Design a protein around this ligand. Sequence first.
Ligand SMILES: CC1(C)Nc2nc(N)[nH]c(=O)c2N=C1C(=O)NCCN1CC[C@@H](SC[C@H]2O[C@@H](n3cnc4c(N)ncnc43)[C@H](O)[C@@H]2O)C[C@@H]1C(=O)O
Ligand SMILES: [Cl-]
Ligand SMILES: [Cl-]
Ligand SMILES: [Cl-]
Length: 422
Amino acid sequence: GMQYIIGIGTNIGFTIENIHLAITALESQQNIRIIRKASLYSSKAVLKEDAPKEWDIRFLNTAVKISSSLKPDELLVLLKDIELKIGRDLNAPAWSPRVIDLDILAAEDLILETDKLTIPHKELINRSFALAPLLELSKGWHHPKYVEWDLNIRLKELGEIVKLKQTLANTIRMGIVNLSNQSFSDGNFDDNQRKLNLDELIQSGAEIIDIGAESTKPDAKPISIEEEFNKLDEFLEYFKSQLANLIYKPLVSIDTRKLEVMQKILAKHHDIIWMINDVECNNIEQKAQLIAKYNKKYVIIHNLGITDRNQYLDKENAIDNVCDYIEQKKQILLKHGIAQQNIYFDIGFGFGKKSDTARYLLENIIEIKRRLELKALVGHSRKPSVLGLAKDSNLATLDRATRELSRKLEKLDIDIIRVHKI
Ligand SMILES: CC1(C)Nc2nc(N)[nH]c(=O)c2N=C1C(=O)NCCN1CC[C@@H](SC[C@H]2O[C@@H](n3cnc4c(N)ncnc43)[C@H](O)[C@@H]2O)C[C@@H]1C(=O)O
Ligand SMILES: [Cl-]
Ligand SMILES: [Cl-]
Ligand SMILES: [Cl-]
């Protein structure tokens, strides 16, 4: 059938989620095939000269190449219906922030000029955020009305665009933001290292950031609920101050084990939070009520709180042990009204597992995912057990092995990988 390039943009809400939901909606049609997804691109909002500053929020843009038996006017109707389902107000103030925009950028060499639909899109050749993903998908494409134009040169003329390292792949990377004393680096008149560390995660491609205040050191000083909350709160305030300018606004996960902390942080910051990553699922019943109320994603971790190393898990019954435990916590979440698609599992390599047990469980991650019918979060970064490394390996060695395992997990389409370095 006929090939089309669909342009997709967003500048409000959970931006990568918005794009993905538009693409899933297309892919769910039996009369559409997705041929290829482009890279993600970041640009400043193109606005009228007198627009309120509140509308000046960075866009996330891409495009998809599809084949379909739908004719152009039928495709347009579908796109409008997808916009509605995602939550767009089709009659909102032009130029104002929007959860999604879908445009038919091109249809092979078709030239269609009607009041309701022009193809190629009239502004294709004036918008770097539409031309760049289009040319990535169709390298030799010429605009059928302007065949002489070298569109690669035109794109350079337009400029004003960043090709991100965030992607539309099945595996998304969760970059670690540790606010404990392990990362303390305040100077006389600055506390900005975590600011450079946030930028490094964003630039390097992290789609999600996981913010936690607990140290990972054995025998670290424990922290009050107030101190944990305050550290998260501060960071979140900072993030909110910068949202509109970031080249890419990451999904935000909060890494805490304490119900109190989850309550107070959600009450204050729910609209910027995508997920709660729970380090120890004690009091899952009341945590489930809070996750239901705020419609967030939640991670069940296999952390049974084992302090006696002799009691660590052996490989031979490890699959059953992890499944039984996660299954029971899943069923509690489901009985509290949480949608199963909002629940992820994490084997928890550093919690109560022998090294061979950790390796064996990672080797069987896909079977575990199928058995539990839950998406997987893998936290392998700097963990010598799953990396197959000596426990005193240096950081360069830990990070190298981490990156190599990351590539392998991405090829296996693991849902989320939690890492220190992308
Ligand atoms: C604010 C602005 C400029 N700032 C940005 N800044 C950055 N950095 N990045 C951005 O992405 C960005 N976006 C921006 C932006 O406004 N976006 C809206 C893009 N789209 C959305 C779909 C249609 S909505 C109106 C009708 O157009 C008619 N129509 C005719 N031809 C077509 C066609 N080929 N495809 C679909 N609809 C078509 C239908 O009948 C529809 O009812 C057209 C509209 C546009 O282009 O004006
Ligand atoms: Cl060209
Ligand atoms: Cl991509
Ligand atoms: Cl991709």
